Amino acid sequence: FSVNYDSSFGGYSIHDYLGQWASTFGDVNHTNGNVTDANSGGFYGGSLSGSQYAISSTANQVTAFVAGGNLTYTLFNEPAHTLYGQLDSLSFGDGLSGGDTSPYSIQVPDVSFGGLNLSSLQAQGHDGVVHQVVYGLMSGDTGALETALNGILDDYGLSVNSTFDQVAAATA
Ligand code: HEM
Ligand SMILES: [Sm+3]
Ligand SMILES: [Zn+2]
Ligand SMILES: [Zn+2]
Ligand SMILES: [Zn+2]
């Protein structure tokens, strides 16, 4: 675990930031009979595999996120539609660019986390964890993530409620 952040948010608490990233990102809306090309997503390192999954708002068109690590998907195999693997990074920013002949990247990065070590097996599925984080995110719900963030910061004397600055010191 580590954190990099645009200086603007040095004294922002993690809860606030995400609350504001999600205020604008919205609910991409990935539900039965609504999943089209817009909510799609799109990996990098396969068609349902990769070191990156990254979607962008289908509401303001620009703000987005990108989960790194090792994320194997499972479109229809038991269990149905359920991301899993080794979620390692999450970075929040605006304007998502790249991701084909090259990786996915954020044009104007606002914040980003590293070493989430969140592991989720295909056995657990829809009620797993990396699945939960990433999916919530795609729907504009940061709970799953602050919960796990608190988890990483517990063992550190902090919470998704301290300031980026605060979190920082206590890391590097
Ligand atoms: C890792 C990110 C993703 C997660 C966590 C995920 C999760 C899900 C979930 C929860 C639904 C359920 C809809 C429902 O039952 O109400 C959904 C729908 C769907 N997803 Fe994924 N998905 C993601 C990536 C993908 C990718 C890469 C595609 C490619 C287009 C895809 C295509 C679909 C389709 C079309 C359905 C609907 C099938 C149906 O009507 O039953 N998903 N996804
Ligand atoms: Sm812990
Ligand atoms: Zn800035
Ligand atoms: Zn912003
Ligand atoms: Zn912005």
Side-chain angles (χ1 to χ4, degrees):
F1 185 86
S2 59
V3 61
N4 298 90
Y5 54 101
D6 178 282
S7 142
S8 153
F9 307 114
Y12 256 83
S13 65
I14 301 172
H15 142 89
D16 287 329
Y17 178 64
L18 304 168
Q20 198 152 275
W21 165 100
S23 170
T24 98
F25 178 95
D27 185 16
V28 126
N29 169 64
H30 207 55
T31 73
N32 290 301
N34 276 180
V35 172
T36 82
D37 270 339
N39 355 282
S40 64
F43 295 59
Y44 157 85
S47 208
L48 302 313
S49 296
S51 28
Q52 295 190 357
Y53 172 53
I55 176 173
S56 38
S57 164
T58 77
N60 93 324
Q61 296 274 66
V62 33
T63 142
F65 89 84
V66 175
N70 184 166
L71 313 202
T72 326
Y73 190 39
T74 33
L75 173 62
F76 299 129
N77 298 298
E78 304 171 61
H81 340 202
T82 51
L83 166 57
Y84 65 110
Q86 210 259 318
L87 194 280
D88 230 335
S89 79
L90 249 6
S91 30
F92 302 83
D94 276 300
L96 175 64
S97 85
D100 208 59
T101 61
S102 44
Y104 268 120
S105 182
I106 307 285
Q107 207 229 188
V108 173
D110 283 357
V111 58
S112 77
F113 308 86
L116 276 53
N117 189 51
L118 309 187
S119 317
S120 182
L121 311 174
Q122 181 196 11
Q124 320 197 193
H126 183 280
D127 253 65
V129 49
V130 308
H131 167 294
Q132 279 204 282
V133 167
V134 175
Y135 185 87
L137 273 175
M138 304 178 46
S139 22
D141 175 1
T142 39
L145 192 272
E146 319 187 55
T147 269
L149 258 293
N150 273 333
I152 309 289
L153 299 160
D154 72 337
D155 327 316
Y156 270 93
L158 305 170
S159 55
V160 280
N161 250 91
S162 335
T163 47
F164 273 108
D165 276 325
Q166 243 159 271
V167 190
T171 291

